[PDB]
């Protein structure tokens, strides 16, 4: 073991092990090697410097020198081999240009988005359309009054967020011009955010999940109607005392570390930020409240035609074509301003431009009313992933497990209790019944798949036991229906 190969850390040859992985960076002065974690760099910085000067050398050497911006139209804006290549969506060059023709993309039809003045008008319009069980269009609610959506009072800003969460709290952050995600300290983000005049690179985080911060989780919550239809909320209720005890007695307890934690996000982005088209993971629905700033969403309805274009777009190696230009005019523009709230159901394809420095609270959720579309989006994701390669963390966490638990703990119980009486479920629970069949059919497919090529937390055996029990109760119920 040559002394050269010892980290000026940490002074070890192997880091103890966010994750250092097993990566080092060398100093371009003293030539000593550091583990990335011991180097003083954060992950977002790993590709920025042409010459890295370690902390010990900086005083006599100066700051690390970053690559020159050689190709602002490329994600590899620092590579001379890319100067002659096409303009990539959305490198800096692409975004600056997009900003000047952006307002020409058409407004939505009234079938696509309904704009309402406040949450009481929302409730009324929502109900006319059949409510959550038929939720198919997006809603923009100008004033939050009536939504029963707990939010911080204006004046609240990034400063309070960093104080509540902590300066060293790491968040997954988008490096906009590079279109990639890196870890960054909240304090480090705040600093870049404060300096409005000097922004070589733009940053936008979408993924600060705070449902486990005891202070934050009380300050920003989902609208009530969302808490009431959320499948995750149904399964991991934030309950206490005897309620909680009964949860334990019924074996309906579920580990906190198994909970998909996606219902309370904080988002902050610099002016000129752009997030490219996507469908939210698991085909979850979204609430999105703008506390400060302004967002422009570009959206396309979840039709088979749009999904085919989107799937092709996602799996194509091309990088120069804006999805909106191949989508046959499906893409619509919707501006959301400070104080306003967007409600998006399953499957909507959307990109978003951040015209102004922003602070947003939102969340993702699954619900029974959109179960078919949610599964259609799952299929869509699985198809795309067959082609490309993506990290698990960009998909809905424990998607399949959640449905096993929901079927076992929620649906099965209701069909069983129903069965032990009359008792036609169409007369008082048609929505529960139709959802059970949709979920069952999709779960049969998952079973089949598993028995053809093995598993990947819930043993194959337990799954089969649940299915057998579901089939039994379903066949029982339909016989109560072949009669009546």
């Amino acid at each position: 073991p040559k002394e050269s190969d010892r980290c000026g850390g940490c002074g070890k040859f192997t880091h103890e092990d966010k994750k250092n992985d097993f990566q080092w960076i060398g100093c371009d002065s003293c030539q000593t090697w550091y583990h990335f974690l011991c180097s003083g760099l954060e992950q977002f910085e790993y590709y920025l410097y042409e010459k890295f000067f370690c902390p010990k050398c900086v005083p006599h050497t100066g700051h690390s020198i970053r690559y020159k911006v050689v190709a602002p139209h490329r994600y590899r804006w620092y590579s001379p081999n890319e100067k002659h290549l096409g303009i990539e969506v959305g490198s800096k060059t692409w975004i600056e240009d997009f900003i000047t023709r952006e307002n020409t993309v058409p407004s939505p039809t009234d079938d696509e988005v309904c704009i309402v003045e406040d949450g009481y008008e929302f409730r009324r319009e929502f109900e006319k359309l059949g409510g959550a069980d038929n939720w198919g269009k997006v809603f923009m609610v100008k004033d939050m009054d009536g939504l029963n959506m707990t939010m911080p009072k204006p004046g609240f800003d990034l400063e309070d967020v960093v104080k509540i969460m902590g300066s060293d709290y790491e968040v997954d952050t988008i490096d906009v011009y590079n279109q990639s995600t890196y870890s960054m300290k909240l304090d480090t983000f705040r600093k870049l955010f404060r300096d409005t005049k000097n922004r070589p690179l733009l940053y936008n985080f979408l993924s600060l999940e705070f449902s486990d911060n005891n202070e934050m989780k009380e300050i920003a919550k989902p609208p009530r109607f969302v808490q009431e239809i959320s499948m995750v909320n149904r399964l991991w209720p934030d309950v206490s005392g005897a309620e909680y005890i009964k949860l334990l007695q019924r074996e309906e307890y579920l580990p906190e570390d198994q909970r998909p934690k996606v219902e309370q996000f904080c988002l902050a982005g610099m002016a000129g930020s752009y997030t490219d088209f996507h469908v939210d993971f698991g085909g979850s629905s979204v609430y999105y409240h703008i506390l400060k700033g302004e967002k422009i969403f570009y959206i396309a309805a979840p039709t088979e035609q749009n999904f085919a274009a989107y799937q092709a777009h996602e799996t194509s190696p091309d990088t120069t074509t804006w999805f909106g230009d191949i989508a046959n005019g499906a893409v619509k523009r919707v501006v959301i301003k400070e104080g306003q709230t967007l409600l998006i159901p399953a499957g909507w394809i959307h990109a978003v431009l951040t015209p102004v420095d922003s602070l947003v609270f939102g969340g993702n959720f699954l619900h029974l009313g959109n179960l078919e579309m949610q599964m259609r989006v799952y299929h869509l994701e699985n198809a795309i992933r067959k082609e490309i390669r993506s990290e698990e963390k960009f998909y809905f966490p424990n998607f399949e497990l959640l449905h096993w638990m929901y079927m076992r703990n929620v649906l099965l119980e209701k069909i069983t209790e129903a069965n032990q009486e009359g008792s036609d479920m169409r007369e008082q629970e048609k929505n529960i019944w139709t959802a059970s069949q949709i979920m069952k059919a999709e779960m049969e497919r998952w079973m089949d798949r598993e028995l053809r090529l093995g598993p990947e937390i819930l043993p194959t055996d337990d799954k089969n036991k649940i299915m057998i029990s579901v089939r039994k109760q379903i066949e029982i119920q339909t016989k109560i229906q072949n009669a009546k």
């Binding site: 992985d21 097993f22 990566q23 080092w24 960076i25 060398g26 371009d28 090697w33 990335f36 790993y46 590709y47 920025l48 410097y49 042409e50 010459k51 890295f52 690390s64």
Partner: peptide, 6 residues
Amino acid sequence: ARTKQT
């Protein structure tokens, strides 16, 4: 920047 992994 010159890097490495093991």
